[PDB]
Amino acid sequence: KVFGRCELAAAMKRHGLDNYRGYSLGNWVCAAKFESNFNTQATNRNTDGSTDYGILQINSRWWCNDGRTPGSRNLCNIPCSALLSSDITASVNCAKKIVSDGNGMNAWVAWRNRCKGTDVQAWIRGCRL
């Protein structure tokens, strides 16, 4: 499916991502918007020959298993297709896991470039969260 800002924002907060490891909700609603265009079924290949899945574009190099990346580590132990359903439970569980590791939300290259250090509250302005 494709979410509207507030509709997403609400689900994300509901799952417990608002101030997860210090990142305001905005940072995540911001990420989702650039990563996938709020689009649950967004799939994009990378230079590596890995693939980015789901509303947050978790890649099949490390986190999920798309049964075609060789050298796949599958850290979330989830078939990548599980990322692509209307319910974001899997995406969010596998996001809490990624950010908790090393480089924080620097992992998402369209958060580094597009969101980081911008009036990020914007993305939740005019939603009753």
Find the catalytic residue in 7, 18, 35, 119. 35
Domain assignment of residue 38, given as a range: 1-129
Is residue 7 among the annotated active site residues?
no
Distance CA 51, CA 80 (A): 9
Q: Among 7, 48, 52, 119, which one carries the catalytic annotation?
A: 52
Which positions make up the binding site for substrate? 101
Resolution of this entry in Å?
2.9
- 47 φ, ψ to 5°? -35, -50
Structure determined by: electron diffraction
Q: Nearest Cα to 31, choosing from 97, 88, 90, 112? A: 112
Q: Is 29 left (phi over 0), alpha (psi -120 to 50) or beta?
A: alpha
Residues that constitute the known binding site: 101
Question: 52: which strand partners?
Answer: 44, 59
- C-alpha–C-alpha distance, residues 83 and 125, integer Å: 27
Question: 22: domain CATH number?
Answer: 1.10.530.10
Alpha-carbon distance of 114 to 34, in angstroms, equals 7
Active site residue 52: yes
Asked if 40 and 3 touch (Cβ cutoff 8 Å), the reply is yes
Closest C-alpha among 29, 31, 33, 21 to residue 129: 29
- Split into its structural domains, the chain has a count of 1
Rounded Cα gap, residues 20 and 98, in angstroms? 12
Helix axes 5-15, 89-100, angle to 10 degrees: 60
